[PDB]
């Protein structure tokens, strides 16, 4: 019983490791896509740039810590 | 003939039971029921208590389906386009017809804007009253139909509806007057609002003010201003132009008015720009 708990914990620590890595990628990808797509009609301006217009990146409070 | 009599028996909207006053083109099958249920958020009608229960368990709407354009600690206002929210506005017109004798549901709700006043709660925003407005009115009416729901009447909500209607006209840089066939209860409320705002404006200005200057600051038409002055016996005619003065009565009315401590609309809390129709 002791061996089973230790082995399925290394797998869950690995998954946490995997989720943190893909999380960091998405954060960067979001920031890069904001730069590519927004630099007439915009989801930012009204369909009819600035570092404060990054409403997608500013949704993460981790990105707010970085910028400040 | 049929439209000249009360259509429904008794209606339970939310927690308050209301007794309709006039005919309303609800589904005629509902006229055979003792109770009709009206959802407090979607204004949907129900004859079956079971259908009502199932509906409430699946309904996630907790406020008028539109943008919140005003909010204080007392009431909030929502702007709803009839073209965008067909189902909700139809339900509102059906509900309002119960208490408006001359309201017409002949055509669909597309050509109207609906400004709905709500009070916030733990459950959400509860509709207490509203007023409609033509998107393009030939006569320049700033209000088509205006209604305070019977469960919230005699609480000053009707005054807040009229105030907000003029705050929209002031933000539009236009003068406005409610649609001309005013009901007996509706006329009584507008005369009270027109007197209160005119008396307050004259007293605080403390200087002679022109009719055109009053019309510019309050968005009231010159017709309504002159008529309000005649009632207060403060209008006179000199050299082809009308002049409004001040007497003991107005200063006395201003004192009793200020003591009432009524709730008012704060224009600084109105985040709203006039819709643009092509």
């Amino acid at each position: 019983s002791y061996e089973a708990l230790k082995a399925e914990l290394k797998k869950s620590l690995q998954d946490r490791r995997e989720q943190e890595d893909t999380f960091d990628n998405l954060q960067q990808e979001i920031y890069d896509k904001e730069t590519e797509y927004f630099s007439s009609g915009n989801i930012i301006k009204g369909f009819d740039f600035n570092n404060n217009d990054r409403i997608f990146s500013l949704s993460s409070a981790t990105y707010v810590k970085q910028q400040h | 003939e049929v439209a000249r009599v009360r259509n429904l028996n008794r209606i339970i909207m939310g927690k308050y039971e209301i007794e309709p006053w006039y005919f309303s083109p609800y589904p005629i099958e509902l006229t055979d029921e003792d109770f009709i249920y009206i959802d407090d958020f979607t204004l949907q009608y129900f004859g079956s208590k079971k259908q009502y229960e199932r509906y409430r368990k699946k309904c996630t709407l907790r406020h008028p389906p539109g943008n919140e354009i005003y909010r204080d600690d007392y009431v909030s206002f929502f702007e709803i386009d009839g073209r965008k929210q067909r189902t909700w506005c139809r339900n509102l017109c059906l509900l309002s017809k119960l208490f408006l004798d001359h309201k017409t549901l002949y055509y669909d709700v597309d050509p109207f804007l609906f400004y709905c006043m709500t009070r916030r709660d733990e459950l959400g925003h509860h509709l207490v009253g509203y007023f409609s407005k033509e998107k393009e009115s030939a006569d320049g009416y700033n209000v088509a139909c205006i209604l305070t729901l019977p469960q919230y009447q005699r609480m000053g909500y009707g005054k807040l509806l009229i105030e907000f209607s003029y705050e929209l006209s002031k933000k539009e840089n236009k003068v406005g007057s409610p649609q001309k066939p005013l009901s007996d209860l509706g006329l009584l409320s507008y005369r009270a609002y027109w007197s209160d705002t005119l008396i307050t404006l004259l007293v605080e200005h403390q200087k002679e003010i022109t009719i055109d200057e009053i019309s510019s600051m309050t968005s009231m038409t010159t017709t309504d201003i002159l008529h309000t002055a005649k009632t207060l016996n403060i209008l006179r005619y000199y050299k082809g132009q009308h002049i409004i003065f001040l007497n003991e009565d107005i200063l006395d009315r201003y004192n009793r008015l200020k003591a009432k401590k009524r709730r008012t609309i704060d224009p600084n809390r109105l985040i709203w720009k006039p819709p643009v129709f092509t």
């Binding site: 989720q19 999380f23 009609g41 | 007794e19 079956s48 055509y107 709700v109 469960q151």
Partner: protein
Amino acid sequence: DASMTWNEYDKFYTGSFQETTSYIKFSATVEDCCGTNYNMDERDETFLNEQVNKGSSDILTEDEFEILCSSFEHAIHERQPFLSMDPESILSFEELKPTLIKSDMADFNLRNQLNHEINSHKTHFITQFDPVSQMNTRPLIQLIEKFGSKIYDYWRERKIEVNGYEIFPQLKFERPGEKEEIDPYVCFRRREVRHPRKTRRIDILNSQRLRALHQELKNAKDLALLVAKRENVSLNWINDELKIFDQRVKIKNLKRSLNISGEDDDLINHKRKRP
């Protein structure tokens, strides 16, 4: 008139609406926030309890019952728009079954696609417009096989009783064929705008604006998907932290019971380079 109070109000109106700091931005319709358009009445629930679930090992829920009836209602309107002409000629379950399979209720195909794109593949794509009670319900295709025929037999009779019209009371709308009856129950007539066409050049220019607007919606959809993914993996992360926390406590208890030393590296977090 409106002094009176309803006593069962607290049963029908439960939940909490949380106020936001900034003004509400909303445009979804009533249909968007209501869920399945079919709602059982008292007659439907007695049938479900006494005829369907009386001795069944597999329970059909009220929510699942409405899913089936809503698909029947949508299919019949498509295949038999003029059912009122001959209500008794309503299609059988087997005849309507192919249409039921292809049915796309409440943007199911769109939600299923979004659920696939996010990399979730778990639970269902859930929005602010969806109630939590719907979580338990089985997929429609599975319901069609287990309960489709039995429920349709019941729904068929109710459809015949109302002469091919709707079971739920409907507003009276104007009919093109009939002369006006000066009927006060007829309401909400529609009058089209009927505007002249623009010049062909403006059509070409607007066709170009349409392609440009299409690209911007694609760009916004990509960002919306990335944010959904970021929150999805963040949900996976906190679910791991909960499971890791319970897997660490249990190991420590068993380890202390056997008095084993060392191997603590999985019981403590380790700092690493994080952007």
